[PDB]
Subunit: 107 residues, 4 copies
Amino acid sequence: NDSAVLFYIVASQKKLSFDYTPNWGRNSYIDALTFPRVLTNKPYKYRVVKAGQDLGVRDSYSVQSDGSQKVNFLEYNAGRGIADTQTIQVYVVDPDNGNQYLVAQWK
Amino acid sequence: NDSAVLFYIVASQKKLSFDYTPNWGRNSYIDALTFPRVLTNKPYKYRVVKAGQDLGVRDSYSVQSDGSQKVNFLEYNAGRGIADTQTIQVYVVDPDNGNQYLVAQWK
Amino acid sequence: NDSAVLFYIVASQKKLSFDYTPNWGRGSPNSYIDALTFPRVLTNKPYKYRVVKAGQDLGVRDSYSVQSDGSQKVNFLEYNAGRGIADTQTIQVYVVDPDNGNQYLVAQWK
Amino acid sequence: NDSAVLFYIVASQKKLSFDYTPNWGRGSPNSYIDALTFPRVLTNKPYKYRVVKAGQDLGVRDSYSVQSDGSQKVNFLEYNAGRGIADTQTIQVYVVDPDNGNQYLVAQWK
């Protein structure tokens, strides 16, 4: 029963809206990923892990006016897109302590 | 640093929008309270505590179409409104285990 | 997967040890539960307990002092008018946060 | 007030005991940190550790077996090419969740 955790957020945030349903971008490559509504309380960076291989952190793109934010894999895979044959994992990085939390995954 | 808790919700909910900024309803009485956007994953009941005195739980009103939900204190104070001289506390009640979590307070 | 919440506690507490394995105490006659004891209880706050007997809220009472072996005992006689609770009813014991009044279920009998 | 998260752990774990008080191990010469030891570590999963030395990610290695007294030791020599880390750099030790790959800071040196 996770509701104590749920309402702890509600207690501390009061009002909060987020969408991390991922919008992956294609031909047999995944070039990027977009989140419709990201959290903005901190300047979060992102880490991409490609089929188990860690591509590191890069600095985030700006958050859009409709609240969306884009993670472009080309800045992470040295200019190449990633083949859908591989699994991809996208972590939010906490700029204060460097913690990272999985927020998206591809097969 | 509460962000691990924050992104645990994000992990498990992906998409989630809530507003518990309270809209208290008045002449020197607080008749009710409204939340603009409540959580709906469970049929949550509400408990009202009046200046330290516990008024118990009652069954919730339906959630509106714009996502709002109203807590009417008259069903809790035996028909009387509550005087603003008193502090009021409104708890969400988890219908599975009966846990309760403070979500609103008046002076 | 809730390891994030777990290690959020670990980072904030660094060192923490608890045991809320319920130890149900029987009265006289045996078919009466008159207490609950926890081997090790969190002590960062003076927590309180609420007992709910077969749907009926017996209310909140201040919690007995913590024992030297870290244990604490909820005495049902304080909540149920000097009688223990028949062991056919379901009993629920909530921990009450003295600061905000939140309550969290920690023990339940049938 | 985060007692809700706390008692969410208590309800799920019932019984739990940990100590991540860092015990920094010095090498030769003394001005080198070559290990970190934790007196009691969570064992519900085979956790892994990542060391970050003065901003440089030394990566993830599998964690030494847990000792009989519940303790576990992160050996920096495994991450830093057989040399210990100069105690003027800041060292960060993250716990890695083997299931999803999340990482949580548990220790930090200056």
